[PDB]
Amino acid sequence: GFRKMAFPSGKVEGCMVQVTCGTTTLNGLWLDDVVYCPRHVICTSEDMLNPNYEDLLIRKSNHNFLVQAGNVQLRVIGHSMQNCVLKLKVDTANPKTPKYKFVRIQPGQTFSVLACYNGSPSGVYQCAMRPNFTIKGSFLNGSCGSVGFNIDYDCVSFCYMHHMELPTGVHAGTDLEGNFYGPFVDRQTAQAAGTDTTITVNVLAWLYAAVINGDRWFLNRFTTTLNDFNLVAMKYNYEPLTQDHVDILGPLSAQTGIAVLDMCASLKELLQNGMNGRTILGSALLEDEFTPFDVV
Amino acid sequence: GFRKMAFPSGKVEGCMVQVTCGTTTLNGLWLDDVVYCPRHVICTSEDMLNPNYEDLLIRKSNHNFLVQAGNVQLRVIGHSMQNCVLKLKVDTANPKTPKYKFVRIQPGQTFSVLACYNGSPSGVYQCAMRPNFTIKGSFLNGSCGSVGFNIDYDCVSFCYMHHMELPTGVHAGTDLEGNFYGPFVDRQTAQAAGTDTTITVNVLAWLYAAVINGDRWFLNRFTTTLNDFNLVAMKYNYEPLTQDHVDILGPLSAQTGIAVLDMCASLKELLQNGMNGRTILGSALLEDEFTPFDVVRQC
């Protein structure tokens, strides 16, 4: 918990391509002989109020789509839709295609984002899917989109594709089968995310991290109960805690000797009172974007 | 300036190898037909207090060094020391060598770090060189080193190579010509970094970013002198502002309508009042790891 690290992006950098239809250019993902991108790329400024993606797409032809892989143009030989992602079939398969799978994550899980600006991968950052199903991303100077992923050995797990900025600085998107995370639609219309909350089990995992790293000043002699803790949590805008969360933290409790409900008592008192001038793990903020697995 | 973003690491990943000497294995950088790595790889555990690097190196021959680029073994055909870096000549140039250059940075400047854990690249993060010439990196689960860079257009600027964790959590290292940043040496003797101060010019550039994104609540009607600002800033462990910092921010004060010394007056009030509970650019802390250059790119 020293610093929020992202996975190295190299395996993903060679899958990014630019996709143009009309005036709209944005980022696509090129795997085997298929390019994936948000289906809203076929829309024009006027289509976006309330489009019929079915209709507009049947009126589209292969030569309407310009796909650039660097300075190499890819010829589109087919297209289909799968929920909110358009699949463009291309003449050539990507020789840089890594071992990969598509997965869907849950709120509270973390991943790395390779962000597009000005038509190329330009930034990488680590983040978490919020409980309101948004991502607190960087959108400055707009964007050309982004892809979220994890690396598990040689295998890349793609878990997120960006579709839109929300009125707040946050982002919403889909998994790679085009299913949205959260209660959003890919139209131009009033949409606001639900209330965000702090991800409690990650905060706990992060305090476990500090104790391992020697920061121990917040421990106290007391315990609490799930029910007593959860009533305090809801008051402070923190997610409830379940027996599953307790189970998942069990390794950290057995390694450290601090029971989970004993550490919840520490977290309970940190809410009500605060850090004063002491810091945890060199940070004076409560971090909730480190998962248990991340602390390892 | 919402998220601290790092540069995509791929051009650097193709350059990381693994140098072994005796029982020590750590990360090296393979550019053209040279491998660069910390000279202390030739050190026995006994030698770390008072190592005689010239004595230790004259006693090595080329096949003492084991260089592995993933699965391939590279063959060492010569070696030389250049300050605190070992240069290992190998018989095959790296076919993945990017356009690159070696630059020495100054404190306050930012760069991305590709961190080696368990013999391979495994994490990437963005940081600044602190004014005491250390990095608040991340040291855990058996580091094998790291390499710092910026990417501009398509050229990689390599600026940092990690050598040691200091007894604090911070890390210290050299540029790629082997000169240490700061007053450190590559021996395990008592070394302590000077006080870490806040990089005043980066906070100001951040604040300008926040005005540009429409946050204005911290602004006040006052202005200050440079010498009065610096007198107050020092009592909070903020670096002093120089005239060069003022000029460098000029672009932002033009775009924004707020003079530099106007914005300093607002920073003075923030330090005196705290943020209450409010936030700037989403942050509840004053952020000092974005440079004016970083800020003028996004804004």
Report d(CA A231, CA A275) in Å as an integer. 21
Q: C-alpha B52: how far from its chain's center?
A: 28
The residues that bridge with B35 in the sheet, in sequence order, are B30, B88
Contact A10 B8 (CB under 8 A): yes
Cα B10 → chain centroid: 18
Location of structure tokens 């289509």: A47
**Which two structure tokens, joined as six digits, stand for B35?**
């491998």
Enter the tokens of residue A215: 């920061």
Residue listed under structure tokens 């839709």: A81
DSSP letter string over A157-211? Answer: EEEEEEEEE-TTSEEEEE-TTSPBSSS--SSSS---PPPP-B-HHHHHHHHHHHH
Do the Cβ atoms of A138 and B5 come within 8 Å? yes
Distance from CA of B129 to the nearest CA of A (A): 14
Q: Do B228 and B276 meet the contact criterion of CB atoms below 8 Å apart?
A: no
**DSSP H/E element including A24:** strand A24-31
Number of residues written out for chain B: 299
Q: Among candidates B256, B131, B275, which has minimal Cα distance to B217?
A: B275
The region, left, alpha or beta by phi > 0 then psi within -120 to 50, assigned to residue B193 is: beta
Solved using: X-ray
Residue A171 φ/ψ, nearest 5 degrees: -125, 155
Dihedral-angle region of residue A271 (phi above 0 means left; psi in -120 to 50 means alpha; beta otherwise):
alpha
Q: In chain A, which residues touch B (CB < 8 A)?
A: 2-11, 13-14, 114-115, 121-125, 127, 136-141, 169, 213, 282, 284-285
CB A79 within 8 A of CB A136: no
Judged by CB atoms closer than 8 Å, whether chains meet at A8 and B140 is answered as: no
Residues linked to residue A156 through DSSP beta bridges, in sequence order: A100, A151
| Amino acid, res. A200 | T
Strands B72-74 and B24-31: unpaired
Specify the 3-state DSSP secondary structure of A282. Answer: coil
Measuring CA to CA, which residue among B197, B145, B189 is closest to residue B167?
B189
Which sign does the torsion angle of CA A143, A149, A150, A154 carry?
negative
Rounded Cα distance between B98 and A292, Å, is 37
Closest of A81, A85, A95 to residue A31, by C-alpha: A95
How many Cα neighbours within 13 Å face the side chain of A223? 8
Plot region of A247 (φ>0 → left; ψ -120 to 50 → alpha; else → beta):
alpha
Active-site residue B127, yes or no?
no
User: Hey, of B4, B124, B275, B289, which one would you mutate to test binding to chain A, going by the most A CBs within 10 A of its CB?
Assistant: B124
- Check A40, A162, A163, A171 and give the catalytic one: A40
Residues of B in contact with A213 (CB under 8 A): 140
Rounded to a whole number of angstroms, the distance from the CA of B194 to the nearest CA of chain A is 17
The strands making up A65-69's β-sheet, listed across from edge to edge, are A72-74, A65-69, A16-21, A24-31, A34-38, A85-90, A76-82
Residue B24, strand partner residues:
B21
Burial classification of residue A48, based on how many CB atoms lie within 10 Å of its CB (0-12 exposed, 13-18 middle, 19 or more buried): middle
Q: Please say whether the beta carbons of A69 and A30 come within 8 A.
A: yes
Sign of torsion over alpha carbons A91, A93, A94, A98: positive
Domain A11-90's class? mainly beta
Name the DSSP class of A42: G
- Among A201, A195, A257, residue whose Cα is nearest residue A229: A201
Residue of A137, A32, A183 whose CA lies nearest to A93:
A32
Cα separations in angstroms, A188 against A43, A167, A185: 11, 12, 9
Contact assessment for residue B290 and residue B205, using Cβ atoms and an 8 Å cutoff:
yes
- Residue of chain B with shortest Cα separation from A139: B2
Check if the beta carbon of residue A192 is closer than 8 Å to that of residue A183.
no
The total of other beta-carbon atoms located within 10 Å of residue B63's CB is: 8
Tokens of B155: 């050229």
| Full 3-state SS string of chain B | CCCCCECCCHHHHCCEEEEEECCEEEEEEEECCEEEEEHHHHCCCHHHCCCCHHHHHHCCCHHHEEEEECCEEECEEEEEEECCEEEEEECCCCCCCCCEEECCCCCCCEEEEEEEECCEEEEEEEEECCCCCCECCCCCCCEEEEEEEEEECCEEEEEEEEEEECCCCCEEEECCCCCECCCCCCCCCCCCCCCCCECHHHHHHHHHHHHHCCCCCCCCCCCCCHHHHHHHHHCCCECCCCHHHHHHHHHHHHHHCCCHHHHHHHHHHHHHHCCCCCCECCECCCCCCCCHHHHHHHC
H or E segment at A253?
helix A243-256
Backbone φ and ψ of A119, nearest 5° = 80, 15
Are the Cβ atoms of B139 and A10 closer than 8 angstroms? no
What CATH number matches the domain at B200-298, 1.10.1840.10, 3.40.50.11540, 1.10.287.3510, 3.40.50.720? 1.10.1840.10
CB-based contact B182:B159 (threshold 8 Å): no
d(CA A101, CA A155): 7
**From residue A238, how far is each of A130, A133, A211, A267, B58 by CA, in Å?**
12, 15, 21, 11, 61
Q: How far is CA A58 from CA A22, A34, A49, B225, in A?
A: 16, 19, 19, 66
Query: What's the topology of domain A200-295?
Result: main proteinase (3clpro) structure, domain 3 (1.10.1840)
The chain B residue lying nearest A286, using CA atoms, is B284
For residue A276, which amino acid is it? N
CB-CB neighbors (< 8 A) of B2 in chain A: 136-140, 169
Q: Are strands B100-102 and B155-165 parallel, antiparallel or unpaired?
A: parallel
Say how far apart CA A98 and CA A151 lie, in whole Å: 11
